Amino acid sequence: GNNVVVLGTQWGDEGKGKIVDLLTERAKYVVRYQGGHNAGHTLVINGEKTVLHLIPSGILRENVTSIIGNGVVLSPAALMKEMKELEDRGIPVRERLLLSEACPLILDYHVALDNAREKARGAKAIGTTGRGIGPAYEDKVARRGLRVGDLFDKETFAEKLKEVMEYHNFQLVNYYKAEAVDYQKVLDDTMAVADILTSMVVDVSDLLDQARQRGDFVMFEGAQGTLLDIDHGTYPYVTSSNTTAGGVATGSGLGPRYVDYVLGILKAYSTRVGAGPFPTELFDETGEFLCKQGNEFGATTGRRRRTGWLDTVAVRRAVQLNSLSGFCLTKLDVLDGLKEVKLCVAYRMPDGREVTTTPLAADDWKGVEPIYETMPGWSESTFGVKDRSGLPQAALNYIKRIEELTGVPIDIISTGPDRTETMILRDPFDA
Ligand SMILES: Nc1nc2c(ncn2[C@@H]2O[C@H](COP(=O)(O)OP(=O)(O)O)[C@H]3OP(=O)(O)O[C@H]32)c(=O)[nH]1
Ligand SMILES: O=c1[nH]cnc2c1ncn2[C@@H]1O[C@H](COP(=O)(O)O)[C@@H](O)[C@H]1O
Ligand SMILES: O=CN(O)CC(=O)O
Ligand SMILES: [Mg+2]
After folding, report:
1. CATH number at residue 70
2. Is RNA-binding among this UniProt entry's keywords?
3. Are residues 109 and 49 in the same domain?
């Protein structure tokens, strides 16, 4: 297909950055359509690492125009910190990254709000990345937030910023009894980059339309993951945006009928960062093994990721929610050496019933127990394997069983972090 969507099928960190970097070799455009700098991805080429947050995972290819669509909540500081890091590395960010004037702005006070509230929640805290993503989407939806296009008129922006900061500070001081955020500083800081921000503005919805008509390849990149979706996730232990496939059209401006192939990034085991339901979570040695072997640490906060087996019941919600066309199985190599691997095939409900559908809100996951299928592991090293022939029979069975359980094929297999430690059985663009 011309327009390919690549998102997380679990709880984020499935390996989207690497895959987007890899597949963008044929694309003209790459588009982030939701989230903000809460996302954190580690790309690796010839051993060289690059960690992205707000910048799309195709920023390393000059033949590709990276774009942050209207759905993304944009942090000027974050953007500036990333542009500079890459520029000092030979990536002329400014000339390949375009952005939507509609993107909501994440300013200092949103971080204060994020923190104040998270502390207010006490024990029931969400475990957010402290990037102020929540408060940004809140201001947006309330129709009081600031967007990129507001910088078009510096004078009126400053006024809008004064009264809004006024609004939020009353809450920070009086209600939360927290430090107020200084207006003059946020204004200065922002104005310091106003011209850089505006220079990258393009009418992305119309752009994508023109691109579509010409038949150009577009790769849409999702942040976080399906079970973190604001509507369809383990509410309230979710993020504030639609991490699923529908977020593509809302936060880009492209029409829904123009999604040709949706690829879901599936990690061979499961992880979750932040509080919330995690049926197949492991707390034993295998949990430590996984975290250790798959170096599971938040690329944004550095927090240790909760690990567990792969949940095919949960993956099957992702399948239907995103109308997946295919999967990209990642970190197969991390399972190398386990005596046995397990797949969650159903849920034992607290009342006794066995089901193969996931509950919706976090509370309804309360007594849910995982029912697994146990399969034999493999001692051979798959790391670096770029062809199935190098994959052991157990590994091939695991892969095959997942396809059987989900009904969706594994078109791409990833056996290592580096860009080329991958197996492409079916390329989404010509598939
Ligand atoms: N062994 C192995 N490692 C892989 C693979 N894919 C990604 N990583 C490793 O997993 C991490 C991917 O970044 P993320 O935050 O986890 O994912 P996302 O883009 O969805 O947020 C990175 O950390 P990293 O070690 O430097 O190399 C990468 C893979 O197939 N095998
Ligand atoms: O990009 C991400 N990767 C993985 N987990 C994330 C990511 N962004 C948010 N989360 C989790 O989503 C929840 C809400 O975070 P927020 O998006 O910072 O408001 C917390 O559990 C986060 O840890
Ligand atoms: O890469 C993103 N992380 O896993 C989120 C975090 O560090 O909190
Ligand atoms: Mg990540």
Report:
1. 3.40.440.10
2. no
3. no
15 known ligand binder = yes
Q: Clarify whether 41 is annotated catalytic.
A: yes
Residues with CB under 6 A from ligand 1: 8, 12-18, 40-42, 44, 49, 295, 299, 330-331, 333-334, 414-417
β-strands 310-311, 369-376 pairing: unpaired
Q: How many whole angstroms from 1 Cα to the centroid of ligand 2? A: 30
Catalytic (active site) residue 13: yes
Rounded to whole angstroms, the Cα distance separating 17 from 20 reads 5
If phi > 0 it is left, if psi is from -120 to 50 it is alpha, else beta; for residue 337 that is left
Q: Domain span at residue 184? A: 101-200
Specify the number of domains making up the chain: 3
Sign of the Cα pseudo-torsion (18, 20, 23, 25, in order)? negative
d(CA 276, CA 291): 18
- Output the residue whose Cα is nearest ligand 1's atom 2: 416
CB 229 within 8 A of CB 238: yes
SS3 track for the chain: CCEEEEEECCCCCCCHHHHHHHHCCCCCEEEECCCCCCCCEEEEECCEEEEECCCCCCCCCCCCEEEECCCCCECHHHHHHHHHHHHCCCCCHHHHEEECCCCEECCHHHHHHHHHHHHHCHHHCCCCCCCCHHHHHHHHHHCCCCEHHHHHCHHHHHHHHHHHHHHHHHHHHHHCCCCCCCHHHHHHHHHCCHHHHHHCECCHHHHHHHHHHHCCCEEEECCCCHHHCCCCCCCCCCCCCCCCCHHHHHCCCCCHHHCCEEEEEEECCEEECCCCCCCCECCCHHHHHHHHHCCCECCCCCCECEEECEEHHHHHHHHHHHCCCEEEEECHHHHCCCCEEEEEEEEECCCCCEECCCCCCHHHHCCCEEEEEEEECCCCCCCCCCCHHHCCHHHHHHHHHHHHHHCCCEEEEECCCCCCCEEECCCCCCC
| Maximum separation of any 2 CA atoms in the chain, in Å | 66
CA–centroid distance, 296 to ligand 1, in Å, is: 8
